[PDB]
Each structure stands twice: as C-alpha cells, then as structure tokens.
Amino acid sequence: GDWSFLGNILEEVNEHSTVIGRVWLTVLFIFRILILGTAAEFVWGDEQSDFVCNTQQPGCENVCYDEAFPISHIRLWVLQIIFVSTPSLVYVGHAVHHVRMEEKRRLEGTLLRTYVCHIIFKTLFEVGFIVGHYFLYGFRILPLYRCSRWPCPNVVDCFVSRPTEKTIFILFMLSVASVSLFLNILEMSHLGL
Amino acid sequence: GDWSFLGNILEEVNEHSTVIGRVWLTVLFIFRILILGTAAEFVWGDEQSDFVCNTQQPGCENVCYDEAFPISHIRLWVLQIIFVSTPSLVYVGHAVHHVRMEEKRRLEGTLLRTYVCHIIFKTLFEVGFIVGHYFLYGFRILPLYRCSRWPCPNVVDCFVSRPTEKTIFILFMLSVASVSLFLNILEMSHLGL
Amino acid sequence: GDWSFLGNILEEVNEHSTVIGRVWLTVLFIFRILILGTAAEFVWGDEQSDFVCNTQQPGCENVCYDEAFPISHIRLWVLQIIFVSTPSLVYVGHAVHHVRMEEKRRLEGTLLRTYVCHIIFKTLFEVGFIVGHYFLYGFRILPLYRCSRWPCPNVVDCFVSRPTEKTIFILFMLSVASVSLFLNILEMSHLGL
Amino acid sequence: GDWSFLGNILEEVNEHSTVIGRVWLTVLFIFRILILGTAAEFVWGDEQSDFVCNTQQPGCENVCYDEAFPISHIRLWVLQIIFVSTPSLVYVGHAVHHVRMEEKRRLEGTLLRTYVCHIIFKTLFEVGFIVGHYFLYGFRILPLYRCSRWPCPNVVDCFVSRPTEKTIFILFMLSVASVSLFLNILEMSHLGL
Amino acid sequence: GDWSFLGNILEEVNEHSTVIGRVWLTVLFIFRILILGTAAEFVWGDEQSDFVCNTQQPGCENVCYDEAFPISHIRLWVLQIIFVSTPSLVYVGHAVHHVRMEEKRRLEGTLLRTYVCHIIFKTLFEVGFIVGHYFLYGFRILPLYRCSRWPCPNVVDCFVSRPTEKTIFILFMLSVASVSLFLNILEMSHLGL
Amino acid sequence: GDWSFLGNILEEVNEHSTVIGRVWLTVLFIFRILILGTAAEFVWGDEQSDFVCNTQQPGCENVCYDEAFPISHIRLWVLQIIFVSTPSLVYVGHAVHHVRMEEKRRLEGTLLRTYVCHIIFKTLFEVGFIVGHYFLYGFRILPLYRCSRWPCPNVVDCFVSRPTEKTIFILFMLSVASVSLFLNILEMSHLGL
C-alpha cells in the first residue's frame, strides 16, 4: 500500500522529538514499513491460493483457511503500525497548535506532560499487539493444520504455504517491536533525568 | 486506487478548519484511506475468485456471488469517503472565493453558516452510510451463504472467502465512522460556545 | 491508468474559469476519475474471465462475450472524460496565447465567444455519450445473456459477472454526468446575466 | 509503462514551437499516451490468454496466436509514439545548443530549416506507421482466425479475444494519427506564409 | 522496474558531456529504458507460463524452458543498460570531486583522459553484450525448441511464446546498440579534432 | 517494493562521507536495489507457482518447496541491504546531532571514531550475510530437488523454476557484495593514512 501521507506527518514529527525519538521513527520507517512493502507482502501474497487441504469436500478449504488465519499477519502488522503512530500525530498537533497560538499573539511544562503520555501510549499499544499476536498465533507457523470445521467431514489435513519463511519474518517483526519498546523506555528515563 | 488529488484539496482544507476539524481530516486519511489501500483491498482481492458453491450448474456461482454481495464492502467504503469529503470541498471553495473577492477590491457571519451546514452534511452522510451498511449486510459476514437464484437447482451452499477477517475490518470501519460522528458533534458544540 | 498530465492542464484551467466551472472541474476529478481508478476498474477487472456460458463449444465464450460487450463500460467512460475535457484545453490554450501576445507587445469580447462555445461543446459531448450509452446498453446489466453467434450451436446461456454492482456504478455515472449538464447550463445562464 | 522522461522533454519542447505544434503535443499526450495507458492496454491484456483454438494439438495455440499477431497493436503504437516524438527532441536539442552558444559569447534562418525538416519527418513517420498497420492488419480484427501452421493438423479455427473493442480502438488511433497529419500540414502552410 | 535514481544521476551527467554525449543519453532513456518498461516487458511477461511442451512427463517443462532460456532477454538488457551507464557515473563523480576541490581552495587535461577512457569502456561493454547475445541466442527466436534434458524421455517438442514479436524487439535492441556505438565513435573522433 | 525513504536518508549521507563512501552508496543503489526491483524480483516471481513435484500426494508440493527454500533469495537480499545500510544512518544521525548542537550554542576526533566503527559494522554485516548464504544454499541452484518430508511418500522429485537464471543472479549479487567489501577496506586504509 501507499504510506506517503503518514510518512509526511511523521517526518514532520522528527523535528519535534528527542534523539531517541528520531531513532524510533527511523526504525518505524526502515524496519517495519519498508520490509512489509518489499519483503513480507510478497511472502503472504499466495497465503490462501496455495493453502491446500486433503479433501474433495466443497467449501472445506475456504472454512479451514479462515479458521487457521482469522486475520492475516500482514494486516495485523499494518494495524499495529497505524496505532503506534497515532500518539505521535497527537503530540505534533498539540505542538503546531501552540505555535499558531504564539504567532497570533521547547518541551515546556505544558507539552512535557503530553509528550510523556504519548510515549506511554506508544508503549501500551506495542505491548498489546505483541501479546495479542502471541495468543492468536504463538510465534511459529507449523506446516500442518488439522481442521474439523463444517463442512469438512471428520478432521482434514491442510497445508500452509511458506511456513518457515513466514516464521522467520514473524520473529523478525517481534524483535523490531521489542527494540521499539527498549527505545521508548530509554526515552522515558532520559526525560526523567 | 490513487487518492492524490482529493488529498491535495483536503490538505488545503486543513488550514481553514477548527482543531477538531484537523483531527477529523487526519482520521479520514490515516484510518480510512490508508487502511483501504494497504490492508482492506487485499482482503477483498479474491472475493469472487475464491467464492465456491457446491454445485455443477453453470452460471450458479456468478448469480449466487452477485446475490450475496450486490455491492462489495470496499466500493461502499470508497463512495462513503468521497461523499463525506465533498462538503469540506464546498466550504474551502467558498473560502477561496471570498479571498479572491477581497483581493480584487476568519469565520465571519457569512462563512459560519456554510461551515455549520457542512458539518451537518458530513454528519448526515456518515449516518446514512452506516445505516445503509447495517441493512444491506448487518455487521457480520457468515461463512455459509445459501442461494436459490436461477439457474441454481433448489437451494445451493456457497462459501465466502475470508469471512472472519472481513468481519474484523467491517467492525473496524464502523468504529472509525462512529469516531468521525463524535468529532463532528463536538465540533458543533465547540462552535456553539 | 495515469491521469497526471490531464490533471496538470485542467488544474491550470481552474484559474481561468467561472466559479461554476471550478465546481465542474472538481466534479470531473473527484466523482469520475477517482472512482474509475479506485472503485469501478476493480469491478470490471474480471469481466471476461468470470463470464461463463453453458456450452462445451470452443470459441463460443469469446464470441458471446464480444457480442454482449462490444466496448466495455469503463473504456466508454474513459473516452467520455477525455472528450468532455478537450474543449477546456482549447480555451486555456487561447488564454495563454493572448497572454503571450500581450507580453510581447479577463473574459474580454474575444475570449467570451470561445468560452461560451467551449461550454456548448462540453454539453454536446456529454449529451452524446449519455445517449450512446442508453442505446448501446440501456441502463441495467441483466445477469443472463442469451447468445446465438457462430460458433455457438442454437442459443446458449451466458452469465455476466457482478451485474448488480455494475448496474449501481452505471447509474452513479449517469447521475454524475447529469450533474455536469446542470452545471454547464447554469454557467451559460450566469454568463447571460 | 512509465512515460515520465519523454513527457519532461516534450513539455520542454512546448515552449519552442508554433501554436499548431503545441496543439500537436497536447494531442500526443492526451489522445495517444493516456488512452494507451488507461484504456487500450487493458483491452489487449488477455490477448493470448483468451485466444482459443479448436484443437487438442499441443503447441497449436502458441504458433496460431504468433501467426495472427506477429506484433501486438499496442506495441506497434508504442513504437509509433516514440518515433514521431524523436524529431521534436532533435529540434529542441538544437535550440538549447544555440542558447548555450549565445550565452558563452527565435526561428532564425538557422533553426527554421531544422524545424521544417522535423515537421517533415514527423509526417513521414506517421504516414509510414499508418501504411504499415494497414498492410499488416487491415483496420478490422475479425473474430475467427483460421490457421494451418505446423504443428496444427490441417486448418484449425482460433477465436480472438475482444475483436469488436479492439477494432473500435484501432479506428480511434487511426483517426488520431490522421488529425496529427492535418496539424503537421497546416503548420507547414503557416510557416510558408 | 523503477529507474528513477539512475535517471537522476544520468540527467546530472547531461550537463557535463559533449553534444554527441547528450544524444547518447537521450537514446539510452527513450529507446532502451522506456521501451523495456512499456513494450518489451509485457512481451516477455508470459514467457514461461505459455511455454508448452508435448509430453506428460513431470518436470520436463521446467527443465526444457531453463535450457532454451538460461537468462531471459529482458534481464540481459537490464544488465546491459546498467553496465553501459556505470562509466558515465564514474566521470561525473570525478567532475564533482574536482568542483568541490576547487571550491575548498571544462575538459581540462586531467578530465580529458578520464572522459576518453569512459567513452572507451562504454564501447567495450556495448560490444561485449552484443557479442554475448549473438552467441547465446543468435538474433532470431524460432517457434520450435527440441529438448532432451533429463527428466524428458527421448527428445520432446516445446513451443515458445510470441517468437516473432520477441524477434522484432531483439533486432530493435540490436539496432539501438549499434547506434550507440556509432555515437561513441563519432564522439571519440570529435574529441580527437 | 518502494525504497524511497531509505534513498532519501542515504542520499543525505552522500554529502557526509568519503569519496570511496560515495562510490559505495552509488553501488548500493545501482547494482543492488535497482536490479532487485527491475530484474531479480521477476525472476523469482513464479518461484513456488512453477515448482512442480512428481507425486499426487496432497500437501507434498507445499512442504517440499518450504524445505528447499526456507527463505527466498530475494528476501534474504532485502534484509542484507537494510542491515548494511543501518550504520550509515547511525553516522549521519550523529552528524546532524552535532550540527544542531553547534547551531544552538568535518571528521573531527569525535566523529572519526563513529565513522570507522560504522565502516567496520558494514563490513561485518556484509561478511555475515555472504557466509550465511553460502551455508544455506551454496552458490548454485540445481534443477532437481529430492524431498522426503512428510506427507510425501518415500523420496519425491521436485523441479525448480529458472535454476540457471537464478544462479546467474546469485553469483552477480555475490560479486557486488565482494566489491562492497573491497571498497570498505580501501576506505579504512585511506582513513588510516
């Protein structure tokens, strides 16, 4: 997809942020969005097309693929990016609002609170998405999925496409998110000092 | 699709709008257009291709898919975006017209009325599209669709692609639209004060 | 497709036009080109691929699809856009020519005539395309097409893809074109006064 | 394909050209490149995929499609555009060369000759491509192609995809090219006066 | 593919080059890259998909297609473009280096040598790629390919997609490369004088 | 994929780097990213679709393709590019930080250390990816892959798509990486002097 607008706003943010914050935005762009667009999206391109179940029951493949993957990982990661970005948008909006107010007439006591809260919310969203991914899928995609969802007769064997590659990228994204967390915590500590 | 032109005009609007209004435009861009383009459009990509009916009647799949999905959700959402955007275009056009008039020779009594009416119309279109979606599809896509449309013999079983993921995104868009409504109402209240 | 160049010229026109004219160009961009690119083109994407005829005669599907859809609606609409845009290009060219002439050495008596004629021609092309669409396809796409074109033996039953959605968008475009006509007529009246 | 670079150069040309010449470049952009990119290329998208021959001889479809369409119309039109554009590039290069020469130290006697010759060559290339198209394909694509090319046993019947639509666009392009010719001739006459 | 970056650098080169050199870069852009992107890449799009062998041996089509086309022509041409472009990059880098050196503190004796060597290397790479193409594929793609590569039993008949069109474009590219050579030689002669 | 953002940052780096460093960035752009996007990605486009195994066991093709290619080469190369680029981002960030610090109030003793370490890390990542590729795949892709992974009965024969072309590009990328190493070493030596 096209991320140009979000990139515009976030680049604008870069100016109004801590050094750790600029590192965080660089990470967001390079190791999440770029990889999604150029590496991961191709990996999941044939997720359902090459999902194959050992049966001749009509509709069994559509229901078994939907059971194994209620939301695809790539879409989960899209949502994750958007939600961890939103607070930064809030903060830069507050900043530009104060700027226009001063013109009509940096991290002051008024902004500081908003900035800290935005770091806090980035952290909360990151942790939430990581936990949700863990419970939904674990962190490994196994090649065999056994499904007993109607209309499938008894339990059928279905086989996932590219399970090892998908696992590699799952773990890669997990690590990127953990790095984001570390950065957020160090930024809170730096402000504290 | 390419939304660049609409984005140009709406970015122009951002200047001539209330703080709540700028939040609303940010929402429009990030949580509706971006998601459509990068997440939802892939979800619905194989909507008809992976729609499968248990029959060997020719033409039964084309007529049963058309019965279940008279308009696809993604196209409904496109139309929604365009129609909720139009009033903002009207208002910014009025603004630039007054600007050129003054040059030849902010929210004044002349504009205020137009602005309030444009908020009102955004609200009406949002509510209308939400209601229309509810009656057309409810808010859950079930995996099994039973169809009795000619040429299908008797009632046939057809199976939808990615029903759970489509449901997730349906609800997501519903929530985004509700947030838009709340923003519009708070903007009317703010003007009232 | 890529409409960037036409958009450049037409944006240039926006300056040299009446307020109604700027509304007309806004409509052209938002409700015709954007929709084509992001909504309609996907609807017609599988027009022939999912066109299915009840026969085992080779070549019957290629000849029956060509009979039902001699020109696809999307291409008809492309041509329509281009032809209703051309006169505006003529007028802005005349304007820039007079500008360069004056530099070497707004709606004057010389331009006024050209402007009125360009409105007239926009109107004629719009009416012509609407009428042509009516005679070629009516304004509803029915699900069943019966074809007796060689090599098909006797009359065969063919089934169209996405007939209801295609009908929705057909009517939508009809309405957009009618709005364009109303705008053109009001612009002629405004000039008359 | 991406025509951006050629568009850059030709837009640069627009300044250094006659009024008829600017009309010609506008035509080139709007009625040839835009249509190719947004209308015609989709029409020919499934040219070979939906080419079907009544046989069960392996390789018969690959050899019969190659016999009927040695070069596809869309690629012929691409080449046409490039070759009718080249002379304009030559002329603008000569112009910028004289400009730099004068700086180191409009249609003069030196340029006039080059300009006239470039018009002449545009005309020659246009006529050549039109004639070549006529002999290669006539100007109508018939639905049935009968092929006797090895490995096909005896004469086989093959059926073309979208013959009527392809015919419509063939004639459209023919008309565009004829308009280009008329423009070139009027430009020569205008210079003559 | 996206050639934007290379285009940036080469456009930068245009300033620092002979008139013949600017012609050469214009050729590179218009008659090699543009054609690849808009004409040739579609021709080779279904190269393997529509490659068909008369056999029911599994794996025979994958091994026979790989034998006939060890590297596809389009990728060969990509590499060719990149390698004939590299020396121009070297030269413009040398130029900007001397510029920065002079600022800290045209074709001089220092640059002249580098320029001549870069022309020489362009020529060598062009000749090498032309010769390599000749030995790898001749200059005509025949419709029938006979393959005896394991697992195929005995010799099997395989049929190429679009052989005549591919031949047309092969010869076209050969001619473009020969024109490049002529330009390089004339540039060396011009410098010599 | 879209590499625009990374390209922005790296172009920014070009200014703050040694001449050898600018050569290295030019290589990165032209011989790694451009080739990936325009040549290699098409080569691997049908990697799994045209992967064929001699069996009628369901799921055997999905598990045998995943065994032969746990990560596809193209994605490996993407990751490689990103990781060899990261240190340059670190260094330019340090540079801009010192710039802003000086404004509030080239290769100095403070920067020199960071620069040398960033060269060192580029080298380490390059060597690591080269070694990892060697152990994962060797440097030749053979046409036949024999797989005994459940559910396949006994050992089955699977046939790779485009093995010779993939081998050519594998070796090409190996050579590009080796050139990068040589450049890094010469840059360390140059600094040492």
Residue numbers in the entry:
A (entry chain F), B (entry chain A), C (entry chain B), D (entry chain C), E (entry chain D), F (entry chain E): 2 to 106, 149 to 236
Extract from the study:
Another notable feature of the lipid densities observed in the CryoEM map is that PC head groups are not observed, despite sufficient resolution to expect such features. In each of the 3D classes, PC head groups and/or phospho-glycerol backbone of individual annular lipids were uniquely resolved (PC Class 1–3). The conformational state of Cx46/50 is very similar in all three classes, and essentially indistinguishable from models derived from the ensemble density map (Cα r.m.s.d.’s = 0.24–0.34 Å). For example, the SN2 acyl chain of PC Class 1 overlays with the SN1 chain of PC Class 3 (yellow and blue). Likewise, the SN1 chain of PC Class 2 also overlays with the SN1 chain of PC Class 3 (orange and blue). This suggested that multiple, overlapping, configurational states are capable of supporting the same lattice of acyl-chain positions observed in the CryoEM reconstructions, consistent with nonspecific and/or transient binding interactions. Collectively, these observations support the notion that although the Cx46/50 acyl-chain interactions appear to be high affinity, the lipid head group interactions are nonspecific and adopt a variety of configurational/conformational states. Notably, the most stable (yet overlapping) configurations (e.g., 1–2 and 1–5 configurations) are the same as those resolved by CryoEM 3D classification (blue and yellow, respectively).
These intercellular channels establish a ~1.4 nm pore that couples the cytoplasms of neighboring cells and enable direct passage of electrical and small-molecule signals (such as ions, second messengers, hormones, and metabolites)3 and therapeutic agents. Intercellular channels are constructed by a dodecameric (12-mer) assembly, with six subunits assembled into “hemi-channels” that dock together through extracellular domains, resulting in a continuous ~1.4 nm pore for intercellular permeation.
